[PDB]
Amino acid sequence: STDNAETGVIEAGNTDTDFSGELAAPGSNHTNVKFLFDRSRLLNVIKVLEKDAVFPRPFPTQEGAQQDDGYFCLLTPRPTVASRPATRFGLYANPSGSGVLANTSLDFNFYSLACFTYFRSDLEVTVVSLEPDLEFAVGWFPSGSEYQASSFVYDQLHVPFHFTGRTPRAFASKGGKVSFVLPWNSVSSVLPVRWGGASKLSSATRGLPAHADWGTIYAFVPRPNEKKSTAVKHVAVYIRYKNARAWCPSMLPFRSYK
Amino acid sequence: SLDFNFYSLACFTYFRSDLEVTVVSLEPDLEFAVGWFPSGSEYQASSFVYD
Amino acid sequence: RGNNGNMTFNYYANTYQNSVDFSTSGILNPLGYLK
Amino acid sequence: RGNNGNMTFNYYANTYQNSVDFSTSGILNPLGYLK
Amino acid sequence: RGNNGNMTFNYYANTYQNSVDFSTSGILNPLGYLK
Amino acid sequence: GPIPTAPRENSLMFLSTLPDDTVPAYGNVRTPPVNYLPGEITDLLQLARIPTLMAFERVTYVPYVAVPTQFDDRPLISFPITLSDPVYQNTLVGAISSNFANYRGCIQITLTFCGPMMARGKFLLSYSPPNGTQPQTLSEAMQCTYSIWDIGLNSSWTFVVPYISPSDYRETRAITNSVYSADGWFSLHKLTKITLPPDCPQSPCILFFASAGEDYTLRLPVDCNPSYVF
Amino acid sequence: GPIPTAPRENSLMFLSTLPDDTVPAYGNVRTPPVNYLPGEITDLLQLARIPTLMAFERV
Amino acid sequence: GPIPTAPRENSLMFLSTLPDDTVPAYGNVRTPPVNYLPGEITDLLQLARIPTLMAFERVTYVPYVAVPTQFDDRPLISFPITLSDPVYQNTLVGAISSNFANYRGCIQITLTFCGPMMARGKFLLSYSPPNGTQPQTLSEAMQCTYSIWDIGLNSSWTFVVPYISPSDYRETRAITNSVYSADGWFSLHKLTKITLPPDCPQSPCILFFASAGEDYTLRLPVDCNPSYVF
Ligand SMILES: [Ca+2]
């Protein structure tokens, strides 16, 4: 049928427009945005704390600084590095040489279906053990805060402060699982899938949002400082968006042609 | 002992409320029990012989 | 609505199960118009 | 119906418990007829 | 009221769940007045 | 007294896709209003129904095709109808479809002529259901479903691929060329040579767009491929 | 408050013939209609009531 | 018969913030009445809305500021607007705010002149939204939001810092000077020099108070810092 594509708006047609025929029945509605995104998926894998921690310093950190790495996980589909927001995803193709290796993460499915510009939704978290018959706990604090770092002495046994606080802490039995849901607590109204502004008024890095996440999570062993074991331990984190919404179209990744 | 949070937000003079208690073990696979007696009493101290 | 199968009973209150926006005081519609 | 004993309560919705066929727009009867 | 999510069902009786004071026989109001 | 009950064999299991909620932890939160943002998306079909540019090989890829001047009976260009085929790879229809398993409805194709206003010509578009061998001449093409499009004032012309299948729903990827994945070919034929006045550039170019139809539908989500990150 | 209950001696048991259903995983699916196929069988007696040939020994 | 049920993946878990109760042990207790105690507090905002004294450095801290006699164009005193800043540390607004994460509404400042009744003068108060560099002269100060306050019979004068933010709610601590934490500066300018009769003490003093506004609000509790015990 004759038409002009330069106008931008083109009306969708059917088989009957130019030939003899008829339209098909609806079928099913599995493409609904709310129904599509309510499925759990892996996000990151982190270690388990066995003592009081030292939060990593900002990125301009030079050598020789003492801190703990790979113990904290951010809750956000965007790329991150060293437990802090980033802009470019990383990958170590040559595990050799000096220097500490930076943790990295990303939400492959979310960015494979990230066809829009802005997003908002609640979020449900779950954790799972990767070691046989392990006892652990999980802690959390909201966006725009920091982790207290010190300990107290009870009966000559040091006890880290992160045991107590008015922000959720949860315990699981031998081989159990931890589950709960969180609200949308960032100051911004919506989470930007892609951004092009600056946060600070000067010396800022363009395109790096400040508070595009839900919070922060970590795991620890409920024992005093006197029982620091000899082997490292790991856990896995699962997230699941709930009651999602989208606001403005965009484009999808570039599938390279061999 | 002390209640750091309570005294960090202790902006008043008098207080009243119920109270819910919980206990947790710090040793792997432990069996224990918990006892309690009200304010203004004392703990009995002796034992009995069975078999 | 959504990937939610229950249709009969809700235990917790709405304001505790979900987040809400505080007040201030069918077929798919198209995107992009020409006049 | 079938090998199903419950007759009072169903938790999940029908469209989530079973599959359905999308629309389009007693004694046993015999098989094979002669006329 | 309070940090209590349930709004439909209570199992135990009130006098066993809570303590009570035995009898004898909106916007925030201000503290401190001048006349 | 306690209600006696017996848990089933399926207890303490963690199922990712389970259709139910869980226990809250930090409720009673109130969020800013979002009435000010326009253009809320309710279904991804709204985006699947927007035309986009396809790709071809210039031997190293371009969206358009250059009309030659030589005379031959082979089709000017022909590609199969299979959403996993490279030509549809980067278009929105294909990109979204690769995340599901089945589809229905009618696909849509659009063209636009971007040559000098003084040119004149005609083209033939045909769609051939599956056969032992694909068409290779105008005589064969005429018999299948086809239409004639002539250059005039208006620049674009839309074509609809009917949904003719032996079964409801069809697979969105072709591990093997069963009748449920591949559905024939599409080919373009130059009916008459182009006429141009003296002192004009030769070899005009033609452009392609691909989009979903009115009655298009998807179903049965599936996990996605993360190879793009490399 | 939590409802107090006590599970019976028969818990975590897997019984093949149990007359009840289980939890769904991938619901909300819709299938093609099957109105076009004639001759639905409702009970196997319909087939049991059809004569057939017996056998014997020719030795 | 037993009701068949299947517990979820989240069982035997201990969650501190869970919004529900537990089983009683020693119920049926009755307590004395408390009708005789007046002044029940229902919300901590009632206490957040009471003015209190700020602090400064005399170089080793005092709540007031001494008006000099020299003449210069720099502001008499200027401090940032960030609840984590030391000046607000001991005031009730700051102390309570340090236990939460977000806030709204308008902050309020109050002053009082405690000099001899025979003195006369005028002062200029200004509030500068964020910029590359903070104001440093009266000409610049006049352009921002400001007001003129003159010594007279009445002793005190109140000032309100408007809530001008790029987003609803703002952070209550400044790990880094993003636009969501810092919100400009406040500065005081001596418009004219003070006039005193002969045989009177020089260098009068001025006093500050800080309190929450009418539409102030907090949100999202957080755990507190116990360092004070040391
Ligand atoms: Ca049970």
Side-chain angles (χ1 to χ4, degrees), chain A residues 1-9 12-21 23-50 52-67 69-112 114-156 158-257, chain B residues 1-8 10-51, chain C, chain D, chain E, chain F residues 1-17 19-57 60-69 72-92 94-106 108-147 149-219 221-230, chain G residues 1-17 19-57, chain H residues 1-17 19-57 60-69 72-92 94-106 108-147 149-219 221-230:
Chain A
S1 57
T2 306
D3 213 328
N4 284 53
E6 304 159 323
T7 58
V9 156
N14 60 69
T15 299
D16 185 46
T17 59
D18 301 49
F19 320 122
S20 309
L23 299 93
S28 203
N29 60 12
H30 283 59
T31 43
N32 203 303
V33 76
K34 198 191 296 299
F35 168 93
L36 211 169
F37 285 111
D38 298 22
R39 299 164 203 282
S40 296
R41 53 183 76 77
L42 180 76
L43 177 61
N44 199 352
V45 169
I46 59 190
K47 294 182 284 185
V48 187
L49 281 162
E50 322 188 270
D52 57 307
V54 169
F55 203 100
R57 303 159 203 250
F59 289 119
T61 176
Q62 83 195 350
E63 263 281 22
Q66 272 313 127
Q67 57 187 35
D69 65 300
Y71 284 102
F72 297 84
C73 168
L74 275 76
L75 272 52
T76 165
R78 292 184 58 94
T80 83
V81 67
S83 310
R84 283 173 179 274
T87 49
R88 290 200 287 192
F89 181 87
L91 185 162
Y92 284 81
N94 187 334
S96 66
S98 189
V100 170
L101 310 179
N103 197 258
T104 54
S105 70
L106 181 59
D107 192 337
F108 300 88
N109 301 15
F110 182 77
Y111 257 97
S112 300
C115 264
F116 30 71
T117 323
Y118 302 126
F119 189 76
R120 193 190 81 169
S121 79
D122 313 45
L123 179 135
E124 142 162 11
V125 176
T126 301
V127 185
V128 170
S129 175
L130 295 187
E131 304 297 332
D133 195 18
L134 179 63
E135 222 60 37
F136 71 88
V138 68
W140 174 86
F141 56 89
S143 184
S145 196
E146 63 191 327
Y147 152 91
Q148 213 293 341
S150 204
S151 64
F152 196 92
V153 172
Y154 286 99
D155 184 25
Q156 313 313 87
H158 290 75
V159 179
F161 265 119
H162 53 237
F163 271 60
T164 177
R166 60 179 76 83
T167 195
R169 249 66 146 179
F171 299 77
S173 52
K174 271 183 170 287
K177 271 92 170 172
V178 185
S179 187
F180 55 93
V181 59
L182 308 172
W184 168 253
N185 60 83
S186 185
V187 302
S188 300
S189 304
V190 298
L191 184 143
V193 179
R194 55 196 90 217
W195 206 53
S199 53
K200 293 181 66 167
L201 262 286
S202 187
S203 79
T205 298
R206 296 205 59 197
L208 170 52
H211 307 297
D213 46 7
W214 277 263
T216 287
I217 280 187
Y218 55 97
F220 58 94
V221 169
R223 276 107 176 87
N225 280 20
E226 320 312 333
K227 302 179 182 290
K228 172 63 182 86
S229 86
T230 69
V232 185
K233 309 178 188 297
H234 318 85
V235 302
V237 180
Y238 282 77
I239 60 164
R240 169 192 190 172
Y241 315 118
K242 185 168 285 295
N243 195 10
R245 296 172 82 174
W247 300 103
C248 176
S250 197
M251 74 203 59
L252 285 167
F254 177 70
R255 297 286 176 170
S256 179
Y257 290 104
Chain B
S1 70
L2 181 59
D3 192 337
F4 300 88
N5 301 15
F6 182 77
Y7 257 97
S8 300
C11 264
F12 30 71
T13 323
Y14 302 126
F15 189 76
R16 193 190 81 169
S17 79
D18 313 45
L19 179 135
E20 142 162 11
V21 176
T22 301
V23 185
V24 170
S25 175
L26 295 187
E27 304 297 332
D29 195 18
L30 179 63
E31 222 60 37
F32 71 88
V34 68
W36 174 86
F37 56 89
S39 184
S41 196
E42 63 191 327
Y43 152 91
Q44 213 293 341
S46 204
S47 64
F48 196 92
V49 172
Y50 286 99
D51 184 25
Chain C
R1 200 176 292 274
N3 191 20
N4 156 288
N6 184 357
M7 203 175 257
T8 181
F9 204 60
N10 271 297
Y11 185 59
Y12 291 114
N14 174 17
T15 87
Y16 277 83
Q17 252 295 355
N18 310 314
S19 98
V20 181
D21 309 12
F22 56 76
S23 55
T24 278
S25 284
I27 302 297
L28 322 168
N29 60 344
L31 298 176
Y33 296 72
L34 205 149
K35 23 173 71 156
Chain D
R1 200 176 292 274
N3 191 20
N4 156 288
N6 184 357
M7 203 175 257
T8 181
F9 204 60
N10 271 297
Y11 185 59
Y12 291 114
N14 174 17
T15 87
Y16 277 83
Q17 252 295 355
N18 310 314
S19 98
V20 181
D21 309 12
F22 56 76
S23 55
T24 278
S25 284
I27 302 297
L28 322 168
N29 60 344
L31 298 176
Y33 296 72
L34 205 149
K35 23 173 71 156
Chain E
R1 200 176 292 274
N3 191 20
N4 156 288
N6 184 357
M7 203 175 257
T8 181
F9 204 60
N10 271 297
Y11 185 60
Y12 291 114
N14 174 17
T15 87
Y16 277 83
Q17 252 295 355
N18 310 314
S19 98
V20 181
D21 309 12
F22 56 76
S23 55
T24 278
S25 284
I27 302 297
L28 322 168
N29 60 344
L31 298 176
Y33 296 72
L34 205 149
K35 23 173 71 156
Chain F
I3 310 307
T5 51
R8 287 284 300 277
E9 61 269 21
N10 165 25
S11 56
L12 310 185
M13 144 193 286
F14 173 56
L15 186 57
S16 60
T17 322
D20 213 0
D21 51 50
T22 50
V23 179
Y26 210 73
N28 205 18
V29 169
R30 307 180 78 74
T31 41
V34 299
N35 270 40
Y36 76 96
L37 263 166
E40 202 206 331
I41 293 163
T42 317
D43 191 347
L44 302 195
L45 284 171
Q46 294 208 24
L47 277 59
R49 297 197 305 215
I50 293 176
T52 47
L53 297 144
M54 302 164 51
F56 304 96
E57 287 175 338
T60 54
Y61 290 90
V62 292
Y64 57 74
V65 184
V67 176
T69 303
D72 195 9
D73 211 27
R74 287 169 295 106
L76 198 153
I77 184 61
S78 64
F79 51 90
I81 299 197
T82 290
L83 308 192
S84 75
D85 200 271
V87 304
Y88 309 90
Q89 189 170 60
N90 289 119
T91 62
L92 277 187
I96 294 175
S97 304
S98 85
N99 300 286
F100 294 71
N102 304 326
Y103 83 93
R104 278 202 76 179
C106 314
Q108 180 155 344
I109 303 287
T110 295
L111 302 94
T112 296
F113 186 77
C114 58
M117 152 65 58
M118 286 310 172
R120 291 285 144 68
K122 262 173 202 72
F123 294 101
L124 184 144
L125 314 168
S126 76
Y127 161 59
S128 175
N131 268 335
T133 60
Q134 62 191 352
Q136 290 288 268
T137 171
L138 187 83
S139 314
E140 295 174 332
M142 148 163 195
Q143 312 193 40
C144 315
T145 301
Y146 82 102
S147 68
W149 170 50
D150 62 336
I151 310 306
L153 167 59
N154 303 72
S155 314
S156 307
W157 171 262
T158 67
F159 186 87
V160 186
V161 177
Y163 178 74
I164 284 164
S165 190
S167 58
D168 299 338
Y169 294 98
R170 299 175 61 77
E171 302 205 30
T172 56
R173 67 194 299 114
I175 62 180
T176 295
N177 313 337
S178 68
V179 302
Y180 304 97
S181 67
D183 197 3
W185 307 260
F186 177 94
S187 61
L188 179 142
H189 262 81
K190 50 177 286 187
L191 194 62
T192 77
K193 82 196 303 177
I194 306 302
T195 55
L196 302 170
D199 278 334
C200 276
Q202 300 94 339
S203 291
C205 305
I206 186 163
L207 194 70
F208 280 95
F209 300 114
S211 91
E214 161 55 75
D215 43 14
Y216 197 76
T217 306
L218 285 168
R219 167 170 150 231
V222 180
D223 268 18
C224 328
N225 174 283
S227 64
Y228 65 83
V229 176
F230 310 90
Chain G
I3 310 307
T5 51
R8 287 284 300 277
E9 61 269 21
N10 165 25
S11 56
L12 310 185
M13 144 193 286
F14 173 56
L15 186 57
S16 60
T17 322
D20 213 0
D21 51 50
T22 50
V23 179
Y26 210 73
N28 205 18
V29 169
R30 307 180 78 74
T31 41
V34 299
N35 270 40
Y36 76 96
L37 263 166
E40 202 206 331
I41 293 163
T42 317
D43 191 347
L44 302 195
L45 284 171
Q46 294 208 24
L47 277 59
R49 297 197 305 215
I50 293 176
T52 47
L53 297 144
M54 302 164 51
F56 304 96
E57 287 175 338
Chain H
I3 310 307
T5 51
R8 287 284 300 277
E9 61 269 21
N10 165 25
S11 56
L12 310 185
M13 144 193 286
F14 173 56
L15 186 57
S16 60
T17 322
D20 213 0
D21 51 50
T22 50
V23 179
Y26 210 73
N28 205 18
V29 169
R30 307 180 78 74
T31 41
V34 299
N35 270 40
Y36 76 96
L37 263 166
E40 202 206 331
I41 293 163
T42 317
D43 191 347
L44 302 195
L45 284 171
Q46 294 208 24
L47 277 59
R49 297 197 305 215
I50 293 176
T52 47
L53 297 144
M54 302 164 51
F56 304 96
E57 287 175 338
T60 54
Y61 290 90
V62 292
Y64 57 74
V65 184
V67 176
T69 303
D72 195 9
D73 211 27
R74 287 169 295 106
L76 198 153
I77 184 61
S78 64
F79 51 90
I81 299 197
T82 290
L83 308 192
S84 75
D85 200 271
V87 304
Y88 309 90
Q89 189 170 60
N90 289 119
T91 62
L92 277 187
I96 294 175
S97 304
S98 85
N99 300 286
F100 294 71
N102 304 326
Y103 83 93
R104 278 202 76 179
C106 314
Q108 180 155 344
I109 303 287
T110 295
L111 302 94
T112 296
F113 186 77
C114 58
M117 152 65 58
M118 286 310 172
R120 291 285 144 68
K122 262 173 202 72
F123 294 101
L124 184 144
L125 314 168
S126 76
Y127 161 59
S128 175
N131 268 335
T133 60
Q134 62 191 352
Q136 290 288 268
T137 171
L138 187 83
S139 314
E140 295 174 332
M142 148 163 195
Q143 312 193 40
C144 315
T145 301
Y146 82 102
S147 68
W149 170 50
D150 62 336
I151 310 306
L153 167 59
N154 303 72
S155 314
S156 307
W157 171 262
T158 67
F159 186 87
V160 186
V161 177
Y163 178 74
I164 284 164
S165 190
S167 58
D168 299 338
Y169 294 98
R170 299 175 61 77
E171 302 205 30
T172 56
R173 67 194 299 114
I175 62 180
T176 295
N177 313 337
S178 68
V179 302
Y180 304 97
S181 67
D183 197 3
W185 307 260
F186 177 94
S187 61
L188 179 142
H189 262 81
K190 50 177 286 187
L191 194 62
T192 77
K193 82 196 303 177
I194 306 302
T195 55
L196 302 170
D199 278 334
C200 276
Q202 300 94 339
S203 291
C205 305
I206 186 163
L207 194 70
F208 280 95
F209 300 114
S211 91
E214 161 55 75
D215 43 14
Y216 197 76
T217 306
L218 285 168
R219 167 170 150 231
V222 180
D223 268 18
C224 328
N225 174 283
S227 64
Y228 65 83
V229 176
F230 310 90

